[PDB]
Each structure stands twice: as structure tokens, then as C-alpha cells.
Amino acid sequence: TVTIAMATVEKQPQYDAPYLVLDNGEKLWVVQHIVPYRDLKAGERIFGNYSFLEAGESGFAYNIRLNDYTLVPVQKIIGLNPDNMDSIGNMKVQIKDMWPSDDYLNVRFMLNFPSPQKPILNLVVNEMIPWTKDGYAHLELRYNNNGSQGRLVPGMVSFKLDDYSPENSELKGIKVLVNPVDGEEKTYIFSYPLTGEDVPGFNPLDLAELK
Template sequence: MKKLSYYLLLLVLVLVPTLQSCDLDDDDGYSLGNYTIALGTVKVDAGNVSFVLDNGEKLWPAATLVPYKNLENGTRIIGNFTLLSDAQNGFDHYVRLNDYSVILTKNIINLTEENKDSIGDDPVRITDMWVGGDYLNVEFDMNIPGALKHRVNLVKNTTLQYPDDGYIHLEYRYNDMNDVTDYVAHSIVSFSLGDMGVGHTDKKGLKIRINSAVNGEKVITIDYKDLQTNKSIAALPGKMKERIN
């Protein structure tokens, strides 16, 4: 499968000597030496933890190399999985969970005259942006802070009147708190789209205004009609890179 950007190597470095990447739709059997990396959401049902990938596939962790049962329902993760079986008992695959990282997950908030200063509008260096599941996922680079935690938000700007063009208008905002170092980090954040997501609205898609560190203010358009569910692909990054910054 197509994997996320280079920073996901953190999930596989310790596994490189023994594992090799595979596709979810490989038909040459299952090997404990293979792995696949995907974004997903934790589902907890009666105390049992499973994972729902952004393409809708359901994974049951029949084995694990790391503790995971303290994960809370709705937590977003990037998971490194080894496939163990085809569909059974309501799941698309039984898997071994090799490792995972928790993704910062936030809701869309309203930007108002009262909170616009704290939300900020510092220039951003977005490396990718895509819709997966009911989330807008944003990969970005940032100069890490010295002491103060930076803030990223997806907002509905209530101080502006947007055109009635059939799209949902949002803004990606960043506040570096005037506290940056020379060290650069790569990260990801997921924003829950809720009733603004694919299949939950009659809108044509999203128009997201960003303040690019490269090209200044611009709008990224994501058309929902272009989004297709592919059961063999668990994450679809890379589609927007040529249109960002």
C-alpha cells in the first residue's frame, strides 16, 4: 500500500531487519515478516479494542508487540500492522499490531473577534492534506518551540461572509506563540469533520484557506466527488502535494 511520508519511518526502523512492506490486497498469503502502515481510529466495544482504517476496513488485533488496551475510543493512530488472515467474525483482517503512534486529533472550532488573536495566523509549511474517513488530515513541518506549545486549528471564520458556492469554507490556523528554535519537526494532525464529512453533507467539498510560508494566502480545494473508497488502500496521502504551498 502507499505509505505516509518519511516521518513514519519511526514506526518501522526497529523492524527493518525482519519485516518488509506489503499491500492490503496481496494475494500471496500472509507472512509474519510483512507489514503495512495505515491511519485508523480506535474502536472500543465492551472493553475490546479494534481499529477502523480510513477506508473503512476493520482490523482485529489477534496479536501484538506493544501494549494497546489502554487506548481510548475515538483515538486516531498511525499503525504498523502485520496481516494474519482474511475476513472473519465481522473483521476484514486479523492482524498483529507491531507499533503505533497517536495522532493529535481536534474538532473544528469557530474563530471570532474574541479568540482570533489566540488562534493566530502564522505562516504554515504544509506538506500534505487529504480527507480520510471522516477526518481532514494535515501533515506539516514546524520549527519546534523552546518552551511554549504551538497551536494548530481548523476554524470556521465567523468574522467573514463567504460566498455561497456550494463548498464548506474553513481556515487552517497556526500560532507559533513567538517561540521557535532552529530545529524542524514533521508532524500530523487530524480534524474531525463530523457532519461536514463525505456522505454527511450535500456540499461539494472543502475550501481551506491557509497562510503559506512559501506563497502567502491561498485556498486549497478538496472536491468530495473526487474521493473514492478503495478497499486495498488504507490511506490516500500525496494527492494534494502539488497544490499546497
């Protein structure tokens, strides 16, 4: 009866409230809210709890009740080179979910509680290895706990894909290298175009766990 899913806040001058855009591009108008939303800014990303109340109007696919959400940090891709390699790291990380959408690589993962340094997860272009011939984007996820060896807690992040996204028509897909906690370095492969089959199903506990 409720949908737990990602969304990006957007705004346009002619409207008097922020609205939500699902990753499939449908725009949702908020007609009821149980938590604050009016001060959300364009480009902010959320993992939210929606009730779809009825078909919308004026280009909004649906009018919704916003039951709850949590903010999801949005990170840029960075360049990995010999100078910053050491500070970027490649420590073992536990991935719970990873999937691309039109604009983002979405990752749910475990990170060490800050004790005190707050850990970093980056999505990098490796500038130290040759071009590949294969028509896929090649990126790497790099985790650094920055000394924090503490208890693991859940985390979500969205990396802006920009030129590595499915809107780049020259790309056959994306390959993402991960150094996993149980296992050896492995490649997640996602073909383009995205049909929606890559998107995991979530429930309220998934959202509750992230607050």
C-alpha cells in the same frame, strides 16, 4: 509488505479488546502485537504499522499484526471571530500532507519545537466573512507558534469534520485556506465524495520521524 496508515480505535461490549478501524471503514482485529495496544480507548487516533495476516471473521475484514504506531491528536473545529482572532493567529506553516477522510481532515506538518510554548494548529470556521454560494465547505487552517521560533519538527493532527465531512450530503467538497511558509495564502480544494485517491502513501520513516 507492511502498511503504514491511519486508524481509529474502537470498542464494543461484546469484544474483549480494542480494534482498529481504517478510514475506508474496514475493521481490523489485532491477533499479534509488537507494541502495547490493550489500553487504547475508543476514538483515539493512530498512525500505525500493520501486517495483514489473513481474512477475518465476525465483521473484521482482516486479522493483523500491529507492528508499531504513534498517537495522533484529535482536535475539534473551532469558531474564528473578531475576539479570538489575535490568539488564533495566521502565521506561516509548512504543510507536508493534507487530506480529508470520512471523519477527519488529516494534516502532517512542521511545527516549531517548544521553546517553551507548544505551538497550535487550528481548523477554523471564519465567522467574519460572508456565506459562499458554491456548495463547498470553507475552513481555514491557522498556525500560531506562540513565540517558539525553534527548530522545526514533524507533527500529525486529525481534525474532526463533523458537519463539514463527506457524510453531509449537501456538500460538494471542502476548501481549506493555508498560509504557507514558501508562498502566498492558498486554497486546498477536495471534492466530495472521496474515492480514496486523495490519500497519500506513507512508509516506516514517516512513522519513525513522528516519535
